[PDB]
Structure formats: C-alpha cells, structure tokens
C-alpha cells in the first residue's frame, strides 16, 4: 500500500555519478525506481556544474527519480570557478581559488531554499560569502569586511 | 524508566546482523525473510527499572 | 632417457613440425633409423627415430586423424 509515493531520500557524492556496481543498494529497488537509470538521471544535474562532492536529494514519485542537488551552495561556488576541465585532468586539484562572481553568487544565495534565518538577501549574502575558501569574493577584493558593505542585491528578491 | 517500554512485532527491517544481541536480554526475535522481525509484543522494561546499556 | 637403462639418446622427430608435438617430460617411443647403428645421413650422431608421443604416434597427429590425450 504505497498511495501516491512522495518519498525523500538523501545521497552524497557525485564525481560523475558512478554507475560501477555501486550506488544505494538498498533504497532504490524496493522503491521500484531502477538501479541503473537513477544515476543516469542524476548525471543531468551534477553534469555541467557540479562534479565536486554533491549532496543530492532523490525524490521518488512512483518510479521517477528527481535528482535535486539540495541548492548545494558549496557546489555552486565551486562550479562558478574558472571552470570546465571535466575529468582526466581535474587532477590539480579541484581547489582552484581565484574567481570574482558578484551576482552569480547572489543567485546561489537565493537558491538556498528561503530557510536561512534570514531577512532575505542582506543577511544571506553574508553567510554564503564567508563560506568561500575557493572564491575569495569580487576579483580585486579579499573577503571579510567587504561583505558588510554589500550595497547591491538587497531589495530585488524580497 | 519513566514508562513501560514496549517493542512492536514487525520487521525492523535489518540485515543478517545481530539477532543474538536482542535475544541476549530476550527480546524474542526471529528473521522473517532476511529482515530481522520482533516475534511478539513484549514489555522489555517496567517503570523505575534501570535500563541496561545493551538494551538501550 | 630410456626407462630400462637411464641411457641418453638423441632421436630425430620424423615427419612434419613435430617438436611442437614432443613436449618436454612426455613419454616417447624410441625406435632406430634402420642403419645398423650408424648416424643418419647428414645428421650428426642421431642413430634414432621417434615414432610416438603420449602413446598416439606422431604419424597420426600430423595428418590430424588423431588428437593428443590431455596430459
């Protein structure tokens, strides 16, 4: 007795996706959904922007697996980088640190799904901005107290 | 124990694991196709009785 | 090396390709070259023939009429 099936399941780590006899085991075959297919669908959202340790919510609706990358703000910054060596020489190393992104980080801050104990954009700007090890803010700027003077995106999304 | 701790007869639904751990304090458990099941509603622990670490 | 004597002989493997059929440490039948001893023709010190490997015969094996017993 399954009625409607709205079910939420959590899985980490997207290099490409895997597929090599790996994956859930347990969750994915008595959820009727597939084994092989679900990571092929998972490629689409972890493909071009983000290959670097995902955090993926798979949501099952009957036999449909919806790979949402839980507005995984970490990946968004990492993928906002100077970016797309896919593989076969990512190998130096995935920590490539020198990238500006003023308002593309702002869209990443919106995506962090309203939850942030916010006041919307003013507060939310500070939280993801500081979370940078990789991006170190805006081209010619360091990061820490630059954040407090963010005169940009505030009204637009509220 | 603030209350009578009871365990419900159904699958848990766990691997071919530690059936022995349950049966040690004698939760009567069996396996019913490979998932560990509790075999009968039992009160493990009775009001004001100190919970053993193994049972916790 | 003969089973009766441990005596070392050099014997020729007559008919085609044949060392490929001999395989080291196989049981081989040593027969002579019909020469009252005396080394073959232009073949130094080879007074002898081989007629068999692993009890089948060489002869059968080349034509292909028979196939070698396993080990």
């Amino acid at each position: 007795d399954p009625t409607e099936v709205k079910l939420v399941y959590l899985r980490c780590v997207g290099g490409e996706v895997g597929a090599t006899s790996s994956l859930a085991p347990k969750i994915g075959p008595l959820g009727l959904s597939p084994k092989k297919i679900g990571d092929d669908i998972a490629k689409a959202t972890s493909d071009w922007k983000g290959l670097k340790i995902t955090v993926c919510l798979t949501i099952q609706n009957r036999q449909a697996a919806i790979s949402v990358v839980p507005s995984a703000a970490s990946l968004i910054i990492k993928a906002l980088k100077e970016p797309p060596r896919d593989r076969k020489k990512q190998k130096n190393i995935k920590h490539s640190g020198n990238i500006g992104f003023e308002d593309i980080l702002a869209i990443a801050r919106v995506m962090r799904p309203r939850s942030m104990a916010r006041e919307l954009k003013g507060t939310c700007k500070e939280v993801l901005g500081t979370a940078q090890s990789v991006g170190c803010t805006v081209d010619g700027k360091h990061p820490h107290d630059v954040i407090d003077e963010l005169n940009e995106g505030s009204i637009e999304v509220p | 124990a603030p209350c009578e701790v009871t365990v419900p007869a159904q699958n848990t639904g766990l691997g071919p694991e530690k059936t022995s751990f349950f049966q040690a304090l004698g939760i009567t458990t069996k396996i019913s196709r490979g998932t560990i099941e509790i075999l009968s509603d039992v009160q493990l622990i009775k009001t004001g009785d100190k919970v053993g670490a193994s049972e916790a | 090396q003969l089973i009766k004597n441990g005596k070392k002989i050099t014997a020729f493997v007559p008919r085609d390709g044949s060392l490929n059929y001999i395989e080291e440490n196989d049981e081989v039948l040593v027969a002579g070259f019909g020469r009252k001893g005396h080394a073959v023709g232009d073949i130094p010190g080879v007074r002898f023939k081989v007629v068999k490997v692993a009890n089948v015969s060489l002869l059968a094996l080349y034509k292909e009429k028979k196939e070698r017993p396993r080990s």
Binding site: - | S20, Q23 | G6, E67
Partner: protein
C-alpha cells in the same frame, strides 16, 4: 545386510536421503557420525570410518572424503507425519540415509562443495557454548546456494551442564540466539524463499535436536511431545508448539499460558530440562537414593553388567538408555529431509548449464531411471589400489550400466565440441562403503555410485552421459581460490618420472588438486587452504609419488624493462671485427605493450594496416611502425626491431641473422636472463665487411646480442613485479581487517561494492605476490576470521627499481637468478659490449 538387499532399497528412491555433515572443527563431526554408525546396525555397525586418512584418526582431524550408508525403519504412525510430495506414501518403513564425508576444513573446499553439490540434505553441528561460528556459515552459504535444506543439532550440551553449571533459563537464551544465528544464513540466502519455502530450521518443527554427541546423548523435541501426549491427554501436534518456550506451564491454574506472567516457569525448563538436570545432579552427587526414584518415574531400565561404578559411568549408561543419539538424529533426517525425488525438482536450474526445457533436464526432475544417464562426478577418491582412481558419482538420470558405453564429458564440454570427449565403457559400478568396495550390476537414479576405470579420462570434474545432446554439469563454483601454492621438486633427480605420474594421481584424487608447471621449471601444487595444501603435500610424499620431496616458496617469474633514453651511441664489433652495428634503446610508451599482448598489436598483422594504429592512436612515427622487423620473445613479444637503416645495401641478407639475435637477446636479458619487457631497439647504421662469406650468422648473431645488451644498459635498466586482484568477502565489520593487511603488503584498494547491501562486501585489492603468504592467517587474525580471500593473476607491473645499482630491491632478485644459472655473479658493463668507433 548383503548386496541384493541394498539394490532393492535403491529402487526405493523416495526413501533415500543423500546428505552431508556441516560443521566447525572441533565441533564433533566425528562424534555424531561415530554415534550414527554404531547405531546403524544393518549396514555398518562398529565405530566406522569417520576420519579415514591416517593421521585423520590420530588428530581426530576431519581432513577429508569418504564413506557412509545407513538403514533405519520408521514407525508406522511416524510415516504419516512425513510431509513431502505426490502421495507416495513415502513408501514402506525403511529409509536409506547416505552420509557423505564433509571436510571440516573451513577453506570452502572444492572437496567440500563436491560433496555438497549433489547433497540433498545437511546436518548442521553448532556447539552451545561457542555458537555460530563463522566456520558453519561458510559451508552453509555454499550449501544454501546449492539448495541445501539444513537440519540443526546443537552439540556439546554436557559441557554446559557439567562444567559451566548452566542456568536452566540461561541455556534457553543460548539455544534461541544460536538457532536464529543459523537463520541469519538461511533467511538471506534462500534462492527465493518462498519457492524454496521457509527453510526455516527453528525448534517447534523440532528440526533442532539437543547435543550430548560424546555421551550419545540425543535430544528430540518430537521425542518429548510423543511421551507427554498420552500423559496430558494432549495432542502431539499441539504439544510441539506448547513446549516451544513462550509455552507457559502455570501449574496452579493448569493454564496453557502464553503468559510469562506470574513468574513463569518456561515449558522448555519445566517438563523438559528439569528431569534431565535432576538425572545429572542426583547421579554426580552419589545420592544412591534419589537416583532410584528418578529412574523409576521415567522408567530407566538398568542394562546388564554395567551396574558397576558410580557417577560419570552411570551418566553415560543412563543417558544412553533414555535418549537414542542416533535415533534423534535419524528421526529428523527421515521426516523433513530431502527426498531425491522431492529434491531434484527444485534444484534443476542450478544443476543444468543447458536446457531447463531439455529432455535430459525433465528426466532429472522426475528421477526417471528410463532417462539419459545423468552422472555428476563428484571426486575420484582414495583407493589403496593406487594403480587407479575410483570415481565417486551420483545417479540423477538413468541406471548405471556395467559396462555401458558412456561419453565422458570433461568440465567445459559443449556438445558441438569434439574437445576431450572419450567414449569408453565403465568396467564396474560400485557401492562405496566407505573403505570397501562391493560390486553391483545396476546403479538406479537417485543413488550414490562408484565408477571404474573412468580414472584416466577423469582428471577432475566429470559428467557421464549416453546423451549426445546432454548437457554438462554446472560443477564450477568449487573455487575459493587454490592460490596457496608451493613449488615441489625432488631431492632425488632420478625420481622425476614418479613425481610426474604422482601429479596425475593427485589431480585425479583431489578435485582441489590443481597441478601446473611454472615458466621457471617448477611444478606448482595448489590448495584452497594452507592446511589443505599440507594435507596434499603429505599425500604426495607418502602415497602417490612415494617421494623424497623438497617444498619451496613460490620463487616467481622476473621480467626486465628499460625506462629511458639510451645515453649512448652503442656500437658493437663482430668476432671478425669488420662487423659493426649501431643501436639505441627506447621505451615502451605504456599503453602500447599492453596492446601488443591483448592482441590489438598483431605480429602477423600486415605492417602497413597495423602501422596506422601504431601511428595515429599510438603516436608512432609512421615509417618506423611499418619498418618493424621483429616482435620478440617468442616473436609475438612486446619488444621491437625498428629498422632505422635504409640504404645499407647489405641489409636484405642480414635480416634473418638480426631477427634470430633479437629473439635470443630478448629471452636472454643481460641482467637476470630475465625476459624482455617493452624495449624498442632502433638500428642506427650498419657497416659491412665486403664479403658475405664473412657476414656469418656466426658473426652477426653475436653482434646483435652484444649491441642490444649495450643499448639496454645505457637504457637505465629496470625490473617488473606482478600484482593481483584480491576479492575478499566480508560481513561488513570484517572489511576493516582486510585493509589493515593490505597496508602491511603495501598494495592498493580497488573498489568496494555490496550486493543487496546488508549483503556482504566485496573488497577488491592489489597484493604483490611475494608478500601475500600467509594471507589466510593474517586476514583472519584481524577480522576475527570472517576474512575469506580470493586472488588471481591480474598483473605485470614495472618497479622503478634500477638493477645496475646494487641498491638491492631489483638486483637481489637478479643476483639469485644469475647464480642459479651459473651465470657470472654480476657483470653488467658497457666495456664488454662496446668497440669505440
């Protein structure tokens, strides 16, 4: 009971049970089977053939493979209980039970699996104090795959009672945990339970019996319910459930009690273990008074000149006179037990590689003795007629002719394949009783049979079929790899024929018996176990070779590589010194030698067509790729002639003498002689002595050898060591110990994947061969031995190891191989190899 009688009972197929004993060492495989044999009384009967291969008996030592048949009769009322299949009525009171020969031998046993695979039934011995025991699990996983319905006996009950002093209620929890700990294995691996229907060995089916195997000593639940049925007026069927110990015995109210409430006297204590305890207590305290009353109440019959002696001696006689150890075992075998008639129906998919819709497969289901003869061999076993090898076999399809002309199908037998199919007649069909032979005219399906002289065409794994369209024999899965390997050579060099003959004998005798010749002239003998190898090693020395044997290593198989650019400008001279060859050595870009081996890089391959693959993909200069001479050694090899000389006029003559010297040099590696790893050699410039009289092959074959040797030494010379894929199987907590071992051995993990993932891990890992002994011991100490390893031959990998420097990681190997070859203990240098223009 003669020969004629046994034949009548074979026809008997519904009343046959072909079985095995599954146990831990030292959990009393031997004691239960001795107890059965003593009590067999028709065809055994005096403690028979449990531990037959001397030192088997002395150590108590269940090594190993033979031999039991039992006959017992069946209770008219008890016949009615007998469940299985198509209203027979499992017909006429007597049942043959054939017990086979389980190796205790936790190695997962090609011999263990051989006994099991036919294996309609299993008797599981788990001990009460040490309960489940990985050792039972390992043999059970294989049994349950092979569809293997088990029946459990919990053994060594007396150890709990006497020594431990064993808490009546405490003993029930140990019973509950342990039986259900067997159901860990059963429930998951039932291939599918419910069409394998709940294999379910619990206690109210009383498929579990309780354990005095030393004191024989047999605990029936059925036995109890039959005694108490007429006493409580109670329902034998009702009583089985009610002695099944949420069985609340409330004496006050008379109350049958699901009731642990009010303080709840378990049924399994009250009526069952309490009189048993009373017999032990009252006897071991020399209370001659209380002993009398206890004996009389349950009716204890005092049996002959045995009245002598007090407590322990009285314990054995009294417990034996009550409780039938054989009888309790036998009841459970008869009643729930594996039918071959019942059994073969389910097991079909497992057994047949072909056709489940095939005529031969349909015959095995029905157990039609009018069918195409379907024979599973089984083993060739142990005859003191060491002048050959008597096959242990089972009949599942048609009878067993003396002398039926029978097509002997070796394991990889596809029927359009002419490959090793031998049609010869079976001289004698034999009852195996187990150190003895009895000659019998006809073998019915489903019976155990001996075949003679299947021996010579029976090296191992056999199927015998009159069936041209038949349908080999899924034997394969015997594996759990024989990777424990030792090289055996005689002290006696005249002894060599007796050795080789003995290798054929071992390989017949033992289906774990893999005998292969190494490249470094060593005969390798290979066992599933370190211990099973020790056993084999004794058998060759004493019996099969009668040899005088030296057991060493494995010495392993060195290869020689070239890392960089030939610094030099390497110039040779002929022994007539006119003859000069100028040479370079190069690597070997790493994908490319692998490609040559694979064999994408075909040496018979048309040079222009395959030049394209070398050039475009490979990064191959196009001309050099066409200009390959030579693949060497043996020339399919990954080492190259590239002919950088194109207008040394002479060249056309010289090509054959160059090719020859290349082949020699490549086998002939200057370091350790020491084959030839991924070196390209480029021929420079060649300077002619005018006379082709004095272009000898006698002159030139040395120039090419010397110059190749010179090129390889400037060559920054290197060695290679091989590394293997290791699939190691774990119930998850055990994975940790695998990794700990790999760390010591320096290797490399692979991947980790889980079946249905509470489902066993498979951990894949790199292990270098020289460090990988004692793998089974080291893994098992950590694990704590859940640790089961399997290991290939994957890999030849290069060491950055420079042998020219006695830095001693590569050159140690080199020095040892040179010295055996006799073989000047170093000398490596370019002074020998180069004639200064």
């Amino acid at each position: 009971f003669t020969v004629d009688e046994i034949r009548g009972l074979m026809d008997k197929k519904r009343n046959i049970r072909n079985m095995s004993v599954i146990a831990h060492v030292d959990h009393g495989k031997s004691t239960l089977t001795d107890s059965l044999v003593s009590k067999a009384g028709i065809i055994a009967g005096a403690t028979r053939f449990t531990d037959t291969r001397k030192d088997e008996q002395e150590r108590c030592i269940t090594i190993k493979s033979t031999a039991i048949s039992m006959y017992f009769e069946v209770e008219e009322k008890d016949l009615v209980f007998i469940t299985h299949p198509d209203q027979r009525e499992k017909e006429c009171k007597g049942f043959l039970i054939n017990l086979i020969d389980s190796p205790g031998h936790v190695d997962f046993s090609s011999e263990v699996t051989a006994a099991l695979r036919v294996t309609d039934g299993a008797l599981v011995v788990v001990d009460c104090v040490s309960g489940v025991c990985v050792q039972t699990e390992t043999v059970l996983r294989q049994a349950i795959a092979e569809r293997i319905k088990p029946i459990l006996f919990m053994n060594k009950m007396d150890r709990a009672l006497l020594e431990l002093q064993l808490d009546a209620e405490e003993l029930y929890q140990t019973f509950q945990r342990i039986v259900e700990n067997v159901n860990v294995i059963i429930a998951t691996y039932n291939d599918d339970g419910g069409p394998m229907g709940e294999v379910r060995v619990d206690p109210s089916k009383g498929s579990v019996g309780f354990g005095s195997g030393l004191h024989g000593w047999a605990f029936t639940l059925k036995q109890f319910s039959e005694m108490y049925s007429e006493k409580f007026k109670i329902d034998v069927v009702k009583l089985m459930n009610r002695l099944w110990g949420e069985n609340f015995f409330n004496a006050k109210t008379k109350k049958w009690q699901k009731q642990k409430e009010a303080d709840n006297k378990r049924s399994f204590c009250m009526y069952i273990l309490d009189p048993i305890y009373k017999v032990f207590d009252a006897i071991m305290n020399y209370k001659k008074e209380e002993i009398g009353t206890l004996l009389e109440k349950i009716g204890v019959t005092l049996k002959h000149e045995d009245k002598d002696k007090d407590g322990k001696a009285l314990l054995k006689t009294v417990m034996r006179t009550w409780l039938p150890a054989g009888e309790a075992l036998l009841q459970m075998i008869a009643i729930h037990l594996p039918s071959p008639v019942v059994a073969q129906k389910y097991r079909m998919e497992m057994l047949y590689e072909g056709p489940h819709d095939d005529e031969a497969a349909i015959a095995v289901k029905s157990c039609d003795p009018d069918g195409p003869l379907m024979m599973y061999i089984s083993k060739m076993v142990p005859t003191s007629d060491k002048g050959r090898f008597y096959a242990f076999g089972r009949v599942f399809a048609g009878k067993v002719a003396t002398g039926q002309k029978c097509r002997i199908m070796g394991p990889n037998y596809t029927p359009g394949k002419k490959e090793d199919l031998y049609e010869k007649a079976i001289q004698r069909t034999i009852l195996m009783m187990g150190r003895y032979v009895e000659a019998i005219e006809d073998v019915p399906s489903g019976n155990i049979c001996g075949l003679v002289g299947v021996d010579q065409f029976l090296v191992k794994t056999g199927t015998i079929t009159t069936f041209k369209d038949a349908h080999n024999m899924k034997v394969m899965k015997f594996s759990v790899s024989p990777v424990v390997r030792v090289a055996v050579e005689p002290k006696n060099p005249a002894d060599l024929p007796k050795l080789v003959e003995g290798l054929k004998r071992l390989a017949k005798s033992d289906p774990m018996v893999q005998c292969i010749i190494e490249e470094s002239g060593e005969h390798i003998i290979a066992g599933a176990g370190e211990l099973h190898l020790e056993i084999c090693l004794k058998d060759l020395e004493e019996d099969h070779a009668c040899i005088p044997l030296k057991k060493s290593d494995p010495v392993v198989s060195y290869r020689e590589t070239v890392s960089e650019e030939s610094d030099q400008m390497c110039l040779s001279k002929s022994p007539n010194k006119h003859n000069r060859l100028l040479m370079k050595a190069l690597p070997m870009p790493d994908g490319l030698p692998e490609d040559i081996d694979n064999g994408d890089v075909s040496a018979k391959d048309e040079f222009k067509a395959r030049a394209r693959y070398l050039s475009e993909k490979y990064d191959y200069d196009v001309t050099e790729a066409r200009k390959i001479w030579c693949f060497g050694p043996d020339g399919t090899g990954p080492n190259f002639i590239l002919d950088c000389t194109k207008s040394v006029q002479y060249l056309n003559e010289i090509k054959d003498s160059v090719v020859a010297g290349f082949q020699w040099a490549s086998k002939e590696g200057i370091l350790a002689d020491e084959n030839l790893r991924g070196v390209r050699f480029n021929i420079y410039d060649v300077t002619l002595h005018a006379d082709a009289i004095h272009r000898g092959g006698g002159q030139i074959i040395p120039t090419t050898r010397r110059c190749l040797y010179a090129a390889a030494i400037t060559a920054k010379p290197r060695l290679m060591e091989p590394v293997y894929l290791c699939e190691i199987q774990c119930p998850e907590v055990a994975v940790g110990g695998i990794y700990g071992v790999l760390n010591r051995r320096r290797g490399h993990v692979f991947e980790e994947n889980q079946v249905v993932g509470t489902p066993m891990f498979v951990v894949k890992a790199y292990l270098p061969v020289n460090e990988s002994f004692g793998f089974t011991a080291d893994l098992r100490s950590n694990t704590g031995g859940q640790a089961f390893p399997q290991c290939v031959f994957d890999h030849w990998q290069v060491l950055p190891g420079d042998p020219s420097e006695p830095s001693s990681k590569p050159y140690a190997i080199v020095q040892d191989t040179r010295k055996r070859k006799g073989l000047k203990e170093g000398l490596p240098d370019l002074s020998q190899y180069l004639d200064k223009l």
